[PDB]
Design an enzyme around this catalytic site. Sequence first.
Site, PDB file in Angstrom:
ATOM      1  N   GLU A 187      -3.759  10.632   3.334  1.00  0.00           N
ATOM      2  CA  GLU A 187      -4.621  10.303   4.464  1.00  0.00           C
ATOM      3  C   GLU A 187      -4.847  11.644   5.141  1.00  0.00           C
ATOM      4  O   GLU A 187      -3.880  12.267   5.617  1.00  0.00           O
ATOM      5  CB  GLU A 187      -3.917   9.349   5.418  1.00  0.00           C
ATOM      6  CG  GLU A 187      -3.454   8.039   4.784  1.00  0.00           C
ATOM      7  CD  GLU A 187      -4.544   7.019   4.587  1.00  0.00           C
ATOM      8  OE1 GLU A 187      -5.557   7.048   5.329  1.00  0.00           O
ATOM      9  OE2 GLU A 187      -4.367   6.143   3.709  1.00  0.00           O
ATOM     10  N   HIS A 224       3.865   1.505   2.753  1.00  0.00           N
ATOM     11  CA  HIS A 224       3.646   0.236   3.447  1.00  0.00           C
ATOM     12  C   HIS A 224       4.064  -0.955   2.555  1.00  0.00           C
ATOM     13  O   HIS A 224       3.230  -1.517   1.833  1.00  0.00           O
ATOM     14  CB  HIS A 224       2.174   0.011   3.792  1.00  0.00           C
ATOM     15  CG  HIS A 224       1.542   1.056   4.660  1.00  0.00           C
ATOM     16  ND1 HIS A 224       1.391   0.904   6.020  1.00  0.00           N
ATOM     17  CD2 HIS A 224       0.906   2.208   4.341  1.00  0.00           C
ATOM     18  CE1 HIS A 224       0.732   1.945   6.507  1.00  0.00           C
ATOM     19  NE2 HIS A 224       0.417   2.744   5.508  1.00  0.00           N
ATOM     20  N   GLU A 247       0.827  -1.186   0.000  1.00  0.00           N
ATOM     21  CA  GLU A 247       0.000   0.000   0.000  1.00  0.00           C
ATOM     22  C   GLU A 247       0.872   1.251   0.000  1.00  0.00           C
ATOM     23  O   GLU A 247       1.831   1.350   0.760  1.00  0.00           O
ATOM     24  CB  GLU A 247      -0.915  -0.025   1.219  1.00  0.00           C
ATOM     25  CG  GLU A 247      -1.829   1.178   1.356  1.00  0.00           C
ATOM     26  CD  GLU A 247      -2.716   1.099   2.580  1.00  0.00           C
ATOM     27  OE1 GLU A 247      -2.865   0.002   3.175  1.00  0.00           O
ATOM     28  OE2 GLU A 247      -3.268   2.151   2.953  1.00  0.00           O
ATOM     29  N   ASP A 269       0.259   5.170   0.452  1.00  0.00           N
ATOM     30  CA  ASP A 269      -0.718   6.189   0.835  1.00  0.00           C
ATOM     31  C   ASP A 269      -0.249   7.547   0.349  1.00  0.00           C
ATOM     32  O   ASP A 269       0.717   8.114   0.868  1.00  0.00           O
ATOM     33  CB  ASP A 269      -0.937   6.205   2.343  1.00  0.00           C
ATOM     34  CG  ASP A 269      -1.537   4.908   2.860  1.00  0.00           C
ATOM     35  OD1 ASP A 269      -2.338   4.280   2.126  1.00  0.00           O
ATOM     36  OD2 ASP A 269      -1.234   4.535   4.011  1.00  0.00           O
TER      37      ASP A 269
END
Length: 442
Positions: A219, A230, A214, A216
Amino acid sequence: QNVGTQAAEEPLNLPISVCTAPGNCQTEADAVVLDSNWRWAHTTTGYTNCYTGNLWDTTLCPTPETCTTNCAIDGVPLADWSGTYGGSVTGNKFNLKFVTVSTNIGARTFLLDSTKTRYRMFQLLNREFTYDVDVSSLDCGLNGALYFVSMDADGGAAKYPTNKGGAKYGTGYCDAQCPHDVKWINGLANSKDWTPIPGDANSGKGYYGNCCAELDIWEANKQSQAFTTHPCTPNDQTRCEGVVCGDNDSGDRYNGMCDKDGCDFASYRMNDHTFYGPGSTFKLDSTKPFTVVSQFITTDGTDNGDFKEFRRFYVQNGVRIENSKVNFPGITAYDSITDEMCAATKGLFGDLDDHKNKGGMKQMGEAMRKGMALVMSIWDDHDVNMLWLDSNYPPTGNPSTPGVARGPCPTTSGVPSEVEVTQANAVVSFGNIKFGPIGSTV
């Protein structure tokens, strides 16, 4: 999942731009599909719900295999996008309403390619990804997120023949949290040992989780924002059980296949509290729209190099705004994600560097090289009330201890039952998406 026959699936058209040089872009006629969790699940040859509220029907779904045989997910027609799910498009802008009143709470969606049969896969190494965002109506406890995950382009259809819908029905979701709340995993209902989540009338957790890498990009709400890598070992979609999921509840957060914390650059947490916030004297004013630019730098400046750096800058009302910097005594003033930044900051914060354990920026890059699916979502947080993003985490921690304070929100904020009333009309907008070589999108 089988596909139901009650309603045609009609994704929302969303054009993006693919660019070769600054102001030289061409339209790519993509579309937005709703995640399969939000779909009506009913009997294959009828109208009877297989899932209602936060429970599977035990007669129809005594086992996952029987559930999968008996049940099907159905389409989202155009009228239902706004009326039921709170999704709409105007030109190149996509809007997601948090609560839509029969009452829908949050949404997760994916970008389809121009055929509308596969996710638009982005090979992000040595590229720049850019979009305009409005999070002015999102306050403490809410998150309007834009991110990439290592889903399969067909949602797993080729791997799992019981998955009849594929990307067309928003199937195959996985992320670095290895979530058990995904209703369909590896082509099967995740109905074994299904447990409702208390205080969440729509959601539960099944036996399996679904893991994958992942990235990001965003956020955020109007109070705090973060970008985070991640990696997982491996990066690709992996159904998990037991310790491999790295479940929080069994003390396994750091024992699983994915880096759950990720390596984050969050301006406020990095000790610049004046960079981003809801007002004109913050450097970046979250009460107004702005452009978010992300550059994925490799070791040799080519598509074949290892991922080495996630750079970030912003544009607001024509004003270029460089990223904030890490601001602690004796720590280098990093303004990007690198392996060194991750080691130094996690060292300071006393956070376990699971990012490094999972192969670091290089491993994150391998996911990005294979191609990742774009996710756009709006959600509240039934586990941790979004305190990790926008408050003190842990809530009992001293806010002067580096790493604890992530935003100005009170530690009592973000209770889903409260935010679902108080912020019912919150809407995140993502628009004017642009993708191309480094330096090409503004």
